[PDB]
């Protein structure tokens, strides 16, 4: 069961690194940007 947990560990590591990049594209799609 730990091998699937290591796969979840690497995906969460990939999204925690580029969290600030992905947060902007969701905010432009959700129209939430303070000009």
């Amino acid at each position: 069961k730990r091998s699937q947990a290591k796969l979840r560990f690497r995906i969460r590591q990939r999204l925690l690194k580029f969290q600030r990049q992905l947060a902007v594209a969701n905010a432009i799609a959700s129209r939430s940007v303070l000009y």
Binding site: L15, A23, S32
Partner: peptide
């Protein structure tokens, strides 16, 4: 590096959006 400049610009609600809390994020 141009995309990370707008992270301080978004509202606090949909800021950390793939995770519910912002405490356990990368700081």
């Amino acid at each position: 590096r141009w995309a990370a400049k707008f992270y301080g610009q978004v509202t606090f609600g949909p800021r950390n959006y793939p995770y519910p809390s912002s405490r356990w994020l990368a700081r």
